[PDB]
Amino acid sequence: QPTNGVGYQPYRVVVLSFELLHAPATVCGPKKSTNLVKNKCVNFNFNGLT
């Protein structure tokens, strides 16, 4: 009922469960890709593998 107290009012709940696996990624954050470099020592991040 719309007159209910704050503990007895309805709440919409969404649980996001995240699948971290050896498998390829299919959901990723918005971070843009950049050029590949070879033979130099470099910092890298492949699909969150920093």
Added chain:
Amino acid sequence: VYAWNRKRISNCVADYSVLYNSASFSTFKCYGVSPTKLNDLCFTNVYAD
């Protein structure tokens, strides 16, 4: 809640700042990850219950 609905999210760019910049949420706990860190991460699937 006895018959909760699951949506599988896949094959897309997420942007969790669309969520974590909002004041509308009465709770937003996270476990094994940080909410502000989510935009650097990747997953095979996400399940939204």
Added chain:
Amino acid sequence: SALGKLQDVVNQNAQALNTLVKQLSSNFGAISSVLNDILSRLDKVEAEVQ
């Protein structure tokens, strides 16, 4: 089989180093044994506990 005393010294020092390298893969109760996973998933205050 005559030189077993010398091969034994080589074997013991190899088994000691292989055990030292394998113990990097142990979690010790952290969320991952990979130190870059912890840092790429958690905030400073949460990561430092792990």
